[PDB]
Amino acid sequence: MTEIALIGNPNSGKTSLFNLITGHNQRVGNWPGVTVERKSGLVKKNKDLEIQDLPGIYSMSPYSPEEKVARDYLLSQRADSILNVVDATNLERNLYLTTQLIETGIPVTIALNMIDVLDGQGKKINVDKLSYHLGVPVVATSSLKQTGVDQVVKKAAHTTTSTVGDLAFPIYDDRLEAAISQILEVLGNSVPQRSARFYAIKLFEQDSLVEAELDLSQFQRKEIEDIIRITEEIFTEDAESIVINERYAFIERVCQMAES
Template sequence: MINVALAGNANCGKTTLFNALTGANQFVGNWPGVTVEKKSGRLKKHKDVVIQDLPGIYSLSPYSPEEVVSRRYLIDGRPDVIVNVIDGTNLERNLYLTLQLMETGLPIICAVNMVDLLKKQGKRINLKKMEYLLGVPVIGISALKKTNLDVLIDMMIEEKHKEYSFPKYDDRLESALSMIEDQLRGVVSDEDLRFYAIKFFEQDDDVWGNVALDSTRRSEIEELIKTAEKVFGDETGSIVANARYDFIARIVDMSIVNEKDFVMTASDYVDMVVTNRILALPIFVLVMWLVYYISIQTIGGAGSDWVNDVLFGELVPDTATALLKSWHVASWMQGLIIDGIIGGVGAVLGFVPQIAVLFLCLGILEDCGYMARVAFVMDRIFHRFNLSGKSFIPLLI
């Protein structure tokens, strides 16, 4: 039996690939103790291959239920192969998760999806060079058009036990990680040393709380972390994040071939503005103000006014009053029904138009990709508070 895990960012085409690989051989439920959907299935024509579709995530930091579920499955369940589905049109953002998946030491295949859309943008990815830089198998696919899926299936079976070297970061960071690995040796398995060393260095609460270390080893690691923060002049979480982004920048610079070097697409212009270090937050404030204005002040507000003033202010109460009087219902009962039941229900339903318009606006922002860009921008800031960048949206709402 071969267990394959599909991992990737939200909206990268992972579910489309899962449906194409499994067809009708799917099982849907919830992960134990978490209201996060669990989808698994058997590979078509290969009943001995079980595919687990992990929730869409941006990192393996345990800041959301999806990230907790994915990390526990990968570390505790240890699938035979990880197929990392990468959105080829947003390579930099997707590779951040790729590096974290590689840090687990599990066998991995990078399936670069949407290569057909990349061609329309006048770009292409040198997959051989990307494979050389990462040190893991890389294949270009189109889950929607089912391009190269047969090759991917062969790789999933053949690459089951292939090993690779971990991504190498700054020499000073590597030195610190190596010393933390020495402290963890014998406490965690050798195959997990790299992952746990990085998580201890990042001061991951889940790891610090669940890995049993004696006081001597724990104090040694704490001293290493303090020394590293003095050397880098930054917090350890930011040190690792910056090291990953530097590594990603080298891959992107060397792998992406832009056939229109001096021509920017509309998406490039949008990214340049909405993810700008200075303009990103003011633009986000403006967008959320527009959402508020539309959902509360104008369209949603008008709907709520009609429900409150007309529907439950005149039509329903007047109709109910006339009906109850014709039935000669006692006055106290009329008051209970009209002022209590109808008035109470109307007070609640009056908010429905505003909430409906609000979530419609947020759905549009999610589908057009703006929410993913906001999460990307806010991730570095919220990482300092042990939160994911995605948590900014519900926090604001």
């Protein structure tokens, strides 16, 4: 009755964590007409929770079936919650996907995974600080030591589209935030309220799939074009690089607050 999308970078420990949560309740097939494996399963300790395992990705670009699948699932609102598996030892790179996942509008809970490995390296991540700055709940997890796994699944199960009333998105440079606002005003009700920021940001980036699979009017197209052009002049960069740099700056800022 509650659906949780499990997703993260490759080699973040998604499968290990998935197998510990779901155990001998797994169903393994594939996505329609494509060789990407599709795993699903019910939570051992609560059969009313279903985990939808998604493919491991580094971002939500449109140039591969793995990412196109992850994107299409999250935008459809089939999941009530995102359980984002983050490799704690490679935190800065991992959070690039997280910023995009938070923007989908489905609530994110973070499984800060492989925490035992971080203990063996001498680094320390302040979990409360990390949680306050990303604006999402965070639980430390180890698939090896089997710690914090029931805690993070429980938190995911109670942090859903039904329970979270007011979502806090990552704030970027105010000049980029103006553009996103202007893109939202023009889009109107052409996009769902929940995932609106995702679409606005992706149209700014000039993403092929969103542009090519959205029935906008011609005036809406021309308005967004000017928002993009004008913004590029303010920054003296192309639209794609503006967003990339602003994500990495926000991530850099966050890690410096939480890292040792």
